[PDB]
């Protein structure tokens, strides 16, 4: 369409809002209640402009930019007298009752209300009466809440109810005494409550974890990185101050993770600033530990490796592609073992085969929301990686969206869409062992063991296409439910099949592939996605290697006398006693890691590897795209004794000193050249971010804002003589303020969102070609996969029905969000949020055991009789006991494993 703003012609979209069309042109209209991902309401009246119909008009009408469609022939005006003074009156009405507590506010220089108060140009106060005050609420360990700062813009409840689907927060109040929160005091049980810090334009909902050890936004040294907590790989902006990581911000990327993070990735950054982390190369000699620098530690490690006869490199899914390849080059290629179990590696390889050889397009996180039906097989999506679950919520709301669009109403007014919808949902069929958080909006939920979920998928694939292998023994009511599922999926334009390796069985992945092939064979636009376990598990599968059990057999047999374990706990992927015995039998154990694990004891050398806040690396998504994360700070800037070098740097220098007896501190793009010249499947990772010699208009990119404070007194407590800024040869980023963070810069990766006059998280709209859409000049990361021309075959192996037995108990995975990751559970803030280690029993199983809820029972695994209190689960089945995977002492390998001796303690 063609509009005229300020007596000037512009060409904008026709079906979008006028506010987003004007913001996509770079013009400045203040707003409080409109969000690009939440639609438009009238909770404020801040976006007021003056509209004229004809080309020439005198009076016009004061309209809202977020309520006016950007149609052909509108002549609106922004900086006239009346609209500007009306917006000044609206910000005056917002400052009518606002507390005078800006310097003691967690927003401060990150506050949208300050930016829009300054932008409207209101400084003189004419209000002389009393203000409005409210009490406070305890909203858990993550969201600090205080109601005085609010302006009643209704964005929090709009996100939390319509978008996030949470059933906790809401509006309780009246004309002026309007309250936003919880009817009681308690933790917000939604997994997306951490996005309220950036959704709220005021300091009502703030980061409690950042409130403790707080610094302002301009003091934050930011970096563009990837969240390492699970496989969704949401683009994040970690920001540090005084040598510790302080705040993770949402980093905009229009392909994956546009506006919202999950709670785990938002609040699981407390492990990188732990005080028990390995910060020095520590080698134990005799019975006491000595501390070395990098040089003599590398020399000694290379001498012991030269004196050894065979080296085993045990990688990890938590490590980067560059670090795992550096290990793969340090040890021989024929002996390099992936740090996962045999069943886990089989599930990962089958998932990769489905991804890159099934011939079915795998959707990204943004385009999951555009699909017409969702079938989730055996995956706790809301608890493993919750961003796909949020996208599934949006895809469910897509039916109400399209039904509203059929009534010729606009798509940016979410109130009319939810008016027309009225609990009209796309078909969502979730299968899990127990109840999920998606059951509120699901068309159907199937509570069954993993084999029964796989058989349900096989029945769905057989009903969709007769070429699939048939499964017998289906009950007529279950057959009717299969008929309902397949007539919902056959009538869907773009069906979606979601699975994962966290189900604990190959047959669920096989059933998901069979259903996707059956949907593709009849001409549907089916997509399939698999949620992997760790952040770079799929990259480890692409690179490949032996399983952990093969390496343990090699260590126990004695064929290798030297083992190098890279960033792996080794207890989550195998049994603890066998791993401890194999590592004790090895004459040389080197552990390259950044976290104090249980294998550092009786380990001959410990290399202080760098975490994602202190290292550069490449991680591969669950979708299949390869993104890369950058360093946030130099660990040697403060406490210069520590080195904390990158894992790939450590292993490559070890390899170079093994060969030529010389230490080489190489560069990251050399390792990228190595991985694209050695592995043809990883040849595409040199397209996510460019070379380190990439300078737009001659200069680098800044980690920190232009108002970085205290540069001559930050390190003055130990030395007044200011040290040189840390020179970064690995990346295209300088560690200090003299870079470039201009929104109109030809780049794909942005450290942080800051524009002149836009100091809020709502400053990301200046970095996009259209606001709420894709990022300008492309998106970070490249796909690395193509849809295959010819798919796989139908998987004939249909599993049998799960028949319970009295002596043997089947372990059912649960995967709690705040407790199914080692890196998450090492954070001190998750301990008050994570539930206590429990076990789950059927009512019939609890009756046959004679125990009640809350009573300790003892179960024996690996010769250890460990005791846990029970919980009665209605959705669980007989013969199964439920366990939270990833716990302390409960490895995720046990998912699908058997259990014995369920006796009361």
């Amino acid at each position: 369409a063609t509009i005229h703003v300020d007596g000037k012609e512009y060409e904008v979209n026709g079906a979008d809002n006028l506010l987003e069309a004007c913001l996509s042109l770079g013009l400045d209209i203040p707003y409080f209640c409109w969000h690009p991902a939440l639609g438009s309401v009238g909770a404020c009246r801040q976006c007021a402009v003056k509209q004229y119909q004809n080309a020439e008009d005198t009076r016009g009408r004061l309209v809202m930019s977020c309520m006016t469609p950007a149609s052909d022939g509108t002549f609106i005006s922004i900086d006239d007298e009346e609209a500007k003074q009306f917006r000044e009156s609206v910000v005056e009405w917002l400052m009518t009752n606002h507390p005078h507590d800006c310097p003691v506010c967690e927003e401060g220089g990150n506050c949208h209300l300050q930016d829009m108060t300054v932008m409207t140009g209101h400084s003189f106060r004419r209000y002389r009466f009393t203000k409005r005050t409210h009490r406070n609420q305890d909203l858990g360990p993550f969201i600090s809440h205080e109601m005085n700062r609010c302006i009643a813009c209704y964005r929090c409840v709009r996100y939390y109810k319509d978008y996030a689907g949470g059933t906790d927060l809401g509006v309780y109040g009246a004309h002026d005494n309007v309250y936003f929160g919880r009817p009681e005091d308690g933790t917000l049980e939604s997994e997306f409550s951490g996005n309220l810090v950036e959704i709220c334009p005021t300091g009502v909902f703030t980061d409690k974890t950042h409130s403790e050890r707080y610094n302002r936004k301009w003091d934050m040294q930011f970096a563009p990185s990837i969240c390492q907590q699970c496989s969704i790989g949401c683009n994040i902006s970690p920001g540090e101050r005084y040598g510790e990581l302080r705040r993770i911000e949402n980093r905009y990327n229009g392909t994956v993770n546009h506006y919202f993070l999950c709670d785990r990735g938002r609040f699981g950054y407390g492990y990188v600033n732990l005080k028990d982390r390995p910060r020095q190369p520590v080698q134990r000699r005799g019975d006491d530990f000595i501390t070395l620098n990098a040089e003599q530690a590398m020399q000694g490690a290379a001498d012991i490796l030269r004196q050894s006869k065979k080296v085993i490199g045990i990688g990890s899914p938590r490590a980067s592609v560059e670090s795992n390849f550096a290990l793969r080059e340090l040890v021989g290629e024929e002996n390099f073992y992936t740090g996962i179990a045999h069943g886990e590696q089989e599930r990962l390889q089958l998932a990769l085969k489905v991804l890159r050889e099934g011939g079915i397009y795998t959707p990204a996180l943004r385009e999951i929301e555009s699909y017409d039906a969702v079938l989730v097989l055996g995956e706790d999506v809301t608890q493993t990686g919750a961003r796909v679950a949020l996208a599934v919520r949006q895809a469910v709301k897509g039916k109400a969206r399209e039904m509203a669009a059929a009534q010729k109403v606009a798509d940016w007014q979410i109130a009319a869409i939810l008016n027309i919808g009225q609990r009209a949902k796309h078909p969502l069929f979730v299968t899990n062992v127990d109840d999920t958080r998606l059951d509120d909006i699901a068309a159907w939920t199937y509570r069954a063991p993993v084999e029964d979920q796989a058989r349900l998928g096989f029945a769905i694939a057989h009903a969709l296409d007769n070429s699939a292998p048939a499964v017998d023994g289906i009950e007529p009511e279950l057959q009717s439910k299969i008929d309902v599922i397949v007539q919902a999926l056959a009538g869907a334009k773009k069906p979606l099949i979601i699975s994962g390796t966290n189900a604990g069985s190959l047959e669920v992945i096989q059933a998901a592939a069979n259903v996707a092939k059956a949907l593709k064979g009849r001409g549907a636009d089916v997509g399939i996605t698999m949620i992997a376990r760790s952040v770079n598990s799929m990259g480890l599968g692409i690179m490949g290697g032996g399983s952990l059990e093969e390496a343990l057999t090699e260590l126990e047999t004695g064929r290798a006398d030297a083992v190098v374990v890279l960033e792996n706990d080794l207890h989550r992927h195998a049994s603890a006693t066998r791993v401890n015995a194999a590592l004790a039998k090895a004459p040389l154990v080197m552990v390259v890691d950044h976290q104090r694990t249980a294998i550092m004891e009786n380990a001959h050398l410990v290399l202080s590897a760098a975490s994602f806040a202190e290292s550069d690396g490449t991680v591969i998504n669950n979708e299949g795209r390869a993104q890369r994360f950058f360093q946030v700070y130099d660990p040697a800037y403060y406490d210069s004794k520590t080195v904390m070098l990158e894992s790939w740097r450590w292993l490559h220098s070890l390899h170079s000193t093994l060969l030529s007896r010389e230490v080489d501190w190489t560069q990251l793009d050399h390792v990228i050249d190595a991985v694209v010249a050695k592995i043809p499947e990883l040849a595409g990772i040199k397209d996510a971010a460019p070379d380190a010699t990439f300078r737009i208009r001659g200069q680098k990119l800044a980690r920190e804002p232009h108002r970085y404070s205290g540069r001559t007194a930050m390190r003055a407590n130990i030395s007044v003589h200011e040290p040189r800024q840390p020179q970064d040869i690995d990346t295209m980023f300088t560690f200090s303020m003299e870079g470039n963070n201009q929104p109109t810069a030809h780049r794909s990766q942005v450290p942080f969102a800051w524009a002149p006059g836009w100091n809020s998280p709502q400053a990301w709209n200046k970095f996009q070609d259209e606001v709420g859409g894709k990022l300008r000049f492309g998106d970070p990361g490249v796909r690395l996969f193509e849809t295959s021309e010819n798919g796989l075959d139908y998987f004939t192996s249909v599993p049998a029905r799960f028949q319970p037995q009295d002596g043997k108990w089947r372990i059912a995975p649960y995967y709690h969000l705040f407790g199914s990751d080692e890196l998450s559970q090492r954070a001190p803030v998750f301990q008050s949020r994570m539930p206590q280690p429990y076990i789950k029993l059927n009512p019939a199983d609890a009756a046959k055991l004679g125990v009640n809820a809350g009573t300790r029972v003892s179960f024996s695994y690996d010769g250890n009789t460990v005791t846990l209190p029970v919980e009665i689960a209605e959705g669980l089945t007989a013969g199964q006991v439920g366990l939270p995977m990833g716990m302390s002492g409960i490895a995720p390998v046990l998912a699908g494993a058997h259990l014995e001796d369920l006796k009361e303690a």
């Binding site: 309401v41 009534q407 007014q413 009319a416 009225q422």
Partner: protein, 147 residues
């Protein structure tokens, strides 16, 4: 009584038109009187009004087409359909057709409520229908609609 008399139910006097009537007693907020907020309050939500032009005649209560009308409009319609349309246009020679329930209130001698045709001035109502005001009052102001 209407349900007992065969009306207001199923097949009303042998027509096949099915209609059911309910009474919803609100708890009481003045914003509930507006049609969109009345629709929002009828759905069991907070009585916030709705934006336009998604109209209640296209998408109102529960996404269905609705019409909200006042008591006096629905009290004037059956007289229209029982006595005729030309009779309804031939009761007052004014642009506003029909009768209205007018009346003065506030320190008046006879504050009441009378049905009068449109085009009737407030002065004659105040002096004859309201009977004038009480002793020692000078009538410094008035308001046509209530508050």
């Amino acid at each position: 009584e209407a349900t007992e008399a065969g009306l207001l139910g199923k097949n009303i006097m042998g027509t096949g038109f099915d209609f059911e009537l309910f009474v919803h007693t609100g708890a009481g907020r003045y914003i509930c009187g507006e049609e969109t907020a009345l629709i929002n309050s009828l759905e069991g939500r907070r009585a916030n009004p709705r934006s336009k032009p998604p109209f209640p005649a296209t998408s109102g209560a529960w996404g269905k087409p609705t019409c909200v009308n006042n008591v006096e409009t629905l009290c004037n319609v059956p007289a229209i359909l029982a006595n005729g349309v030309e009779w309804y246009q031939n009761i007052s020679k004014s642009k506003d057709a029909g009768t209205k329930l007018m009346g003065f209130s506030g320190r008046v001698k006879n504050p009441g409520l009378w049905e009068l045709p449109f085009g009737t001035t407030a002065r004659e109502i105040l002096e004859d229908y309201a009977g004038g005001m009480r002793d020692g009052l000078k009538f410094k102001a008035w308001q046509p609609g209530g508050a």
